[PDB]
Amino acid sequence: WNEAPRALPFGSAPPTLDGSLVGDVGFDPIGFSTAPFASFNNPIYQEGNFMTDVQWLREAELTHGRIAQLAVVGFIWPALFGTFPGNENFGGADAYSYVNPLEAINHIPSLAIYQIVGGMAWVEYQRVQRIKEQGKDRISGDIGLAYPGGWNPFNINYSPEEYAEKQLQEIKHCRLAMLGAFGLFFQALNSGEDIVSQLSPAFAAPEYAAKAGYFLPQGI
Amino acid sequence: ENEIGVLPPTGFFDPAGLSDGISQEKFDSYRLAELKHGRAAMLAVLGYVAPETYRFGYDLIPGELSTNDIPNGVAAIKAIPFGGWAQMIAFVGCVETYGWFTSPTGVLDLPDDILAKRQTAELQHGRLAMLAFLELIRHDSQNLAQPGFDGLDNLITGLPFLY
Amino acid sequence: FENELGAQPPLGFFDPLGMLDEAGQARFDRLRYVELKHGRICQLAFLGNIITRAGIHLPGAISLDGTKFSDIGNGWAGSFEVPKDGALQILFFVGFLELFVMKDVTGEGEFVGDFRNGALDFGWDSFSEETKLQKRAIELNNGRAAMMGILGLMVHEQLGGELPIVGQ
Amino acid sequence: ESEIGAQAPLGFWDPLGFLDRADQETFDRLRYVELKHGRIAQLAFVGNLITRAGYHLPGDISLGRAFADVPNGIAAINGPDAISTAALLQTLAFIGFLETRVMIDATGESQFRGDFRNGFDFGWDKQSPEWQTNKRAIELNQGRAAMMGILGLMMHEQVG
Ligand code: CLA
Ligand code: CLA
Ligand code: CLA
Ligand code: CLA
Known part of the structure; x- marks a missing residue:
């Protein structure tokens, strides 16, 4: 095993991480x-x-x-x-x-739930087909969203470096959003309220702590 | 004589001389018991705390006997009917005798030194968990037999933020 | 066996249990025959169940002693009011169909399930080579779908609940 | 595969074709499962009959409950007014301990899978040529008949 990888600089990382895949720093203890x-x-x-x-x-x-x-x-x-x-x-x-x-x-009506489930099933049936037919040449992601060659209503084109930068941004946002979604779910569960009704009260002052107001006469 | 599981806190810790001469097979059997007992103790200590806050909401007997209602601790074995225990033990035996519900992708292929260190750590954590289980059941049974005894209240005296 | 029909593109060849592995040819033929028989039976059963639940009943569905067609319910529980001898007659008829008629009674075996009695063709050589494969696929797959649907209807009928679309 | 198990009016009886491919180990495992x-x-079956007759062990099973107080049949283990779960669990543990520490092959008698001599036997030694075969056809046969009988008893006591 390699020693002292970026992130966990006092640990070790398996030799299988190597370079390749975008977002690689060596975090695999x-x-x-x-x-x-x-x-x-x-x-x-x-x-x-x-x-x-x-x-x-x-x-x-x-x-x-x-x-x-x-x-x-x-x-x-x-x-x-x-x-x-x-x-x-x-x-x-x-x-x-x-x-x-x-x-x-x-x-919510059951039609909404069943529509969502059917849509997800269709999307990932397409993903399974692409995985099987692409062999041992996997570009990761697939499903054919906006890139040249696949579906592309907006005709988005990118230089290879720009594509790599977009991939890095996507992976970083994915990790951070997973952490954020976990936090939001459990905060809302424990607190029994949505995020806005939990944060907005803690913005200006409690009602029992604020002063009565100003009653000093003016002109005396 | 000198194998995995010897750490500087002590040096051999074999006062009664239960090993002495024996044979390699007997020592291997002893080690396999020490591991199985330790893993079971770890899982038991972990699962003695979880039901204190969460509880799957399924019915053991359709119509009655919801998991939301049965007490936690050593009072559960009286509440659960014998058929449930029989089915659970049958499932565990299916896992143990055959290879079912077991995957060979969890064995990993770590280097020798990493493997040795992790095996010693596994043994130590298990050995701690066994005595943890001992105190746990001691306190639970003592309080359940006669309330108020051992004046500390609630199951799990530590971690008071649960209650 | 990895190229025969039934390997629809969506998933391709799909054998998770892997019972085929090593096999001759009678095993595959028997499996296809039983799959096709189940598909046809389930298609008919689902069509009958949905048309009975739709609300339209035969004015001539009445049986001995009147027994107006509107009295008969639907479902497994709803089938426990037909006369015993009528059901015995139906079962005898179906068993006779299995003993004779519903087989290859000519000796032509172009594929499994092609009974046709060698006498009741509705136009077969008209279709192209690929149209045969397409029709055999479109059939089998709709049979599989009907199988799953009728199993679900039967299970949820006893489970108790409210499936979408269909009232229940 | 023509061995002990095909006789008595009907010969090799495999309507469902389990042994279409067949193996020595597979056949041995199936035979052992059937025998057990x-x-x-x-x-x-014998135990259920004898406890149906009216005989009961003396004493008490749990703390304040005699052997003659528990119901007879399925209700003994499951349902209201049954044996305390602790006693059943301990009896099951005893059964498991004896099964895993008593009736295994610890010497090497081998022969057929299911032989638990370990040096202890009465007459299975002097006799040799064919009494083994006809006796085994009895052991198993009776097993099949009693298996059907106990299944029928459970059916009747559940529906009756
Ligand atoms: C602590 C108690 C204990 C222990 C450790 C064992 C240990 C063992 N027994 Mg065992 N046994 C025990 C008590 C015990 N027994 C008791 C009390 C009985 C009843 C008298 C039996 C009856 C028994 C039989 C009949 C067999 C074993 C077998 C075995 C071996 C493998 C078991 C296995 O794979 O798991 C079990 C794994 C499973 C997946 C269980 C399958 C359950 C089946 C499929 C369902 C049966 C129907 C169900 C019980 C009722 C359905 C109700 C209906 C409404 C649907 C193993 C040596 C087997 C053996 O030796 O293998 C050759 C075997 O054939 N035992
Ligand atoms: C179950 C079978 C099934 C299948 C295979 C399909 C398949 C399809 N439907 Mg469809 N549909 C179904 C059932 C089904 N539907 C049902 C029951 C309804 C309600 C009557 C609809 C209503 C419907 C409409 C109105 C439309 C489709 C459309 C489509 C097509 C595009 C779907 C798409 O890209 O959505 C993609 C959907 C998504 C990406 C949504 C995913 C959202 C999140 C990320 C998923 C998270 C899931 C979550 C984890 C589940 C847990 C949460 C849950 C507890 C709530 C596709 C052919 C569209 C079309 O063009 O067809 C003509 C269209 O306009 N469907
Ligand atoms: C010694 C182990 C042990 C034993 C005897 C029990 C026994 C019991 N538990 Mg329990 N439990 C355990 C460990 C154990 N648990 C652990 C480790 C956890 C943490 C996850 C829990 C969490 C838990 C909850 C949340 C609840 C129970 C409940 C119960 C009672 C009802 C039976 C049931 O549903 O159990 C379920 C038992 C389990 C889920 C344990 C599964 C452990 C196996 C080894 C996991 C195997 C891998 C798993 C399938 C996923 C694979 C992951 C992959 C990475 C390998 C019963 C008295 C219920 C109750 O009514 O409490 C009184 C209940 O609501 N338990
Ligand atoms: C399709 C499979 C299947 C079927 C038909 C059943 C059927 C049943 N389960 Mg069950 N179960 C299954 C799979 C299945 N289970 C699986 C995979 C698990 C996870 C391991 C469980 C876990 C489970 C629990 C935890 C409980 C049930 C219970 C029940 C019963 C519901 C209550 C009842 O009828 O009281 C009538 C009950 C009886 C007449 C007593 C039945 C005694 C059992 C069947 C004997 C089991 C013997 C064992 C398998 C083999 C010998 C021991 C082995 C170690 C050698 C019912 C008989 C409940 C129950 O038993 O309530 C009493 C219950 O608490 N089940």
Whole structure:
């Protein structure tokens, strides 16, 4: 094992991290990268045509991170910008009026849940197809969003260095957003309130501590 | 004689001479017991604290006997029906006798020195957890047999921020 | 076996349990035959169940002693009011269909499940080479979907609840 | 594969074709499972009959409950008015300890998987040519019959 890697400068990192994958600093004290995580019971495994273990872990990291990135804004938005203009002529019985994120899950029509689940299933069926058909040449991410060659309504083009910089930004935001989403969820659970109704009271003053006011007459 | 698990706090700690001569197979069997007992103790200490705040909300018997209701500690073995214990022990035996629900990707391939250090650490943490379990059940049974005895209140005397 | 039909693009060849591994040819034929039989049965059962739940019932569905068609319920519990002898007659008819008619009674075996009685063709050589494969696929897959759907309907009927779309 | 187990009107009886591929180890494992299930089944059948007759051990099982107080049948282990869970757990532990420390092969008698001589036997030595075969066809056979019988008893006592 290599010794003294950036991050954990008094520790060690496995030899499998190397360079390659963007975002690599050497943070891997336990392992998880020297084990066949993409070969044991994988039903879509293809001998001599699949990806490596660390790339599989990167795929998992990207998935968890993108979900968390969406989830943070999902937690914050309805409480601060107001609810969706929906619920009109829907007979929802103020379903969308609720702003506590842990309460809205018990008041939405089942059609919304099933639509979300179906959309996710479709997206990742496409992802599975791409993974199988791309062989042992995996560009990571895939799913064909806005890059030349795939779907690209805005026709985004980037120089290779710009593409690498975008990849680095994406991975950093993914990690930070995972931490933030975890924190927001458990804060809201323990406090029993959304983030805005928990932070706004602690902005100016408590009611029992503020002074009565100014009553001194003027002109005397 | 001299194997993994010897640390400077003591030097051999074999007062009763339970090893003496024996044989290699007997010592290997002893070590395998020391590990299994230690891992079980670690898991038990960890799982004696978790139900104090969380509790999966499923029904052991459909209709009654929700996990939200059964008491925590040594009073659970009386509440849970015998069939549940039988099924759990059967599942553990399925895990142990066969290789089911076990994956060979957790063994890892660490270098020799890292492996030795981690094995010693595993043994030490297990050995601490065994005595932890001893105090835990001592206090629980003493308080349950006659309330008020051992005037400290609540399960888990340490970590008072739970209550 | 990794190239036969049923390897739809979405997932490709899919054998998680890996029961095929080493096999001859009777095993694959038997598996395909039973899969196709289950698919056809489930398609018919699902269509019947959905049309009965839709609300339209046969005016001629009445049985002995009147037993107006509107009295008959739906579901496994809702099927416990038909006369015993009528159900025995239905079972005897289906068993007869399994003993005769529903087999290859000519000796032509272009593929498993191509009974056709060698006499009731509705136009087969008209289709192109690829159209045969497409129709055999579109069939099998809809059979698989019907199998899963009817199992879900039967399970949730006894479990108790409110499935979307369908009232329940 | 024609060995002990195919006789009595119907010969090799494998309607579902489990042994279409077959192996020596697979057949040995299946035979051992069948034999163990059969032995346990006949012992349980005898025990259920004898406790149905009315006989009971003297004394008390738990703290203040005689052996003759517990119900007869399934209700003994599960349901209201059953044996205390502690006693059942300890009896199960005793059964497990005896199973894992008593009836294993610690000497090397081998022969058939399921032989637990360990040097202790009565007559399985002097006799040799064929009494082994017909006796084994009995041991297993009776096991099958008693297995069906105990299953039927459980069915009846659950539905009756
Ligand atoms: C602490 C007690 C203890 C211990 C350690 C053992 C240990 C062992 N027993 Mg054992 N046994 C015990 C008590 C014990 N027994 C008791 C009290 C009985 C009843 C008298 C049995 C009856 C028994 C049988 C019949 C067999 C064993 C076997 C075994 C061995 C493997 C067990 C295994 O793989 O896990 C169990 C793993 C499982 C996955 C369990 C499968 C459960 C099946 C599939 C379901 C059975 C139906 C269910 C019980 C009821 C369904 C209800 C219905 C409404 C659905 C092992 C040496 C087996 C053996 O020797 O292997 C060749 C074997 O065949 N035992
Ligand atoms: C279950 C089967 C199924 C399948 C395979 C599909 C498949 C499809 N639907 Mg669809 N749909 C379904 C059920 C299904 N649907 C149901 C039940 C409804 C309600 C009646 C709809 C309503 C619907 C509409 C209205 C539309 C589609 C569309 C589409 C197409 C594009 C989907 C897409 O990109 O969304 C992508 C969706 C997302 C990326 C959302 C993901 C959001 C987060 C990140 C997922 C997080 C999931 C979370 C972890 C789950 C836990 C939370 C939960 C407890 C709430 C695709 C062919 C669209 C189309 O063009 O088709 C014509 C379209 O406009 N569907
Ligand atoms: C000695 C171990 C032990 C024993 C005997 C019990 C026994 C019991 N626990 Mg418990 N528990 C344990 C450890 C243990 N637990 C641990 C380590 C945790 C922390 C996760 C918990 C958390 C916990 C909760 C939150 C609850 C219980 C409850 C219960 C009771 C109901 C049975 C049940 O659902 O258990 C469930 C038992 C477990 C979940 C333990 C699983 C441990 C195995 C070894 C995990 C194996 C790996 C796992 C499948 C995932 C793989 C990860 C991968 C990295 C390998 C029962 C008395 C319930 C109750 O009513 O309390 C009174 C309840 O609500 N337990
Ligand atoms: C499809 C599989 C299946 C089925 C049909 C069942 C069925 C049942 N489970 Mg169950 N279970 C399963 C899988 C399954 N389980 C799995 C995978 C787990 C996780 C390990 C559990 C964990 C579990 C728990 C924790 C409990 C149940 C209980 C029950 C019973 C519900 C209450 C009842 O009917 O009281 C009638 C109950 C009886 C008449 C007593 C049944 C005695 C059992 C079946 C004997 C088991 C013997 C064992 C498997 C083999 C011998 C021991 C082995 C060590 C050698 C019911 C018989 C509850 C229960 O037993 O309530 C009493 C309960 O508390 N189950």
